[PDB]
Design a protein around this ligand. Structure first.
Ligand SMILES: Cc1cn([C@H]2CC[C@@H](COP(=O)(O)OP(=O)(O)OP(=O)(O)O)O2)c(=O)[nH]c1=O
Ligand SMILES: [Mg+2]
Ligand code: NA
Ligand code: NA
Length: 324
DNA sequence: CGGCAATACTG
DNA sequence: CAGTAT
DNA sequence: GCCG
């Protein structure tokens, strides 16, 4: 909700991110993800330090954007950054691949297309490069969720289908469509991916598969590309997860996010000797001196999302209140 | 000093 | 496993 | 980067 001083920081955060300095980029993310949820412009160095997420190092940079109106750090960002960002926006390519391609002399998508060795996923990502950078209106996301739900309830009307992610958080636009599928009887959700996916392929709704371990009967997620019928339609990313009714609440909480919200909640659980994943909320978890899990602990009953919050000693938050 | 979420595929 | 993804 |  404020301080365009962040637009200068966002640039650095993205630079460190594409370059692989993930932890540093996370630090900037939180500092920025904070300078927004805040209220008044920061006018003092000590007034910065006071904000949770901002430190002495960050404050000194927040003073050069006000006292000087410009951050000199941006003037020394590697010329490789724009290219690394270009490359890492290819679905399936991350910082490691982008850096490798850059080191190999590649500088444009034309270079990637004609000379780079692409994985199957990356070839799909490049083929839909522009489309994958666009967000769809939530109205279209509804159409996509309904298309999957109809095909699902087609072979089992008992299947519960819910659109999660940014859609459930009530955003105006959606990057992809995240559909969670389960079954109230807690058993019939058995290997339905085969039937659902082949049904969606049957009607030409699915165009490309990115992640889909279909040889496996334990498949949990399907990440792919779909496109609604008619003219003026673009390819949209689709992410579907089938979960046992037993893990419905945690799966719903997870898939709804946001990402930063999930990380915050999971971090809280850890401080309480507990653990949260899309599968369950556990207590009495044993972790070594490195926060690594050594002992599983006990799964706690979590029939509903509110239960998870309750068990964590947190007040319930509607999906729209989790848009962190 | 050293964690910063916890998990699922791919090859 | 590393890399990438949610 | 931040912070316990
Ligand atoms: C990326 C990521 C995501 N999640 C969860 C929580 C969100 C859902 C859906 O992710 P998505 O990227 O579609 O996000 P979404 O919120 O739907 O935003 P878009 O509208 O799709 O961009 O997955 C997570 O726990 N950790 C992560 O690192
Ligand atoms: Mg989404
Ligand atoms: Na990418
Ligand atoms: Na497959």
């Amino acid at each position: 909700h404020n301080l365009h001083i962040t637009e200068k920081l966002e640039v650095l955060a993205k630079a460190y991110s594409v370059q692989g300095d993930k932890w540093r980029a996370l630090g900037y993310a939180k500092a920025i993800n904070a300078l927004k949820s805040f209220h008044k412009p920061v006018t003092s160095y000590q007034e910065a330090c006071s904000i949770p997420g901002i430190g002495k190092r960050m404050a000194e940079k927040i003073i050069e954007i006000l006292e000087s109106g410009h951050l000199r750090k941006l003037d020394h960002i590697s010329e490789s950054v724009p290219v690394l960002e270009l490359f890492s926006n290819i679905w399936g390519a991350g910082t490691k691949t982008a850096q490798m391609w850059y080191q190999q002399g590649f500088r444009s998508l034309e270079d990637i297309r004609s000379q780079a060795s692409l994985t199957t996923q990356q070839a799909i990502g490049l083929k839909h490069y522009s489309d994958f950078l666009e967000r769809m209106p939530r109205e279209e996301a509804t159409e996509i969720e309904q298309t999957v739900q109809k095909a699902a309830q087609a072979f089992n009307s008992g299947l519960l289908c819910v659109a999660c992610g940014s859609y459930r958080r009530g955003k105006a636009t959606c990057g992809d469509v995240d559909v969670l599928i389960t079954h109230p009887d807690g058993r019939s959700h058995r290997g339905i991916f085969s039937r659902l996916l082949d049904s969606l392929r049957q009607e030409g709704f699915l165009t490309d598969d990115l992640v889909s371990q279909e040889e496996n009967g334990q498949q949990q997620k399907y990440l792919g590309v779909c496109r609604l019928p008619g003219p003026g339609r673009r390819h949209r990313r689709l992410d579907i997860i089938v979960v046992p009714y037993s893990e419905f609440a945690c799966a719903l909480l997870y898939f709804t996010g946001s990402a930063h919200f999930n990380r915050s909640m999971r971090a809280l659980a850890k401080t309480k000797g507990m653990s949260l994943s899309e599968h369950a909320l556990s207590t009495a978890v044993v972790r070594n001196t490195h926060g690594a899990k050594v002992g599983p602990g006990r799964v706690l009953p979590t029939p509903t999302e509110k239960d998870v919050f309750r068990l964590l000693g947190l007040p319930y938050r509607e999906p729209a209140e989790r848009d962190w």
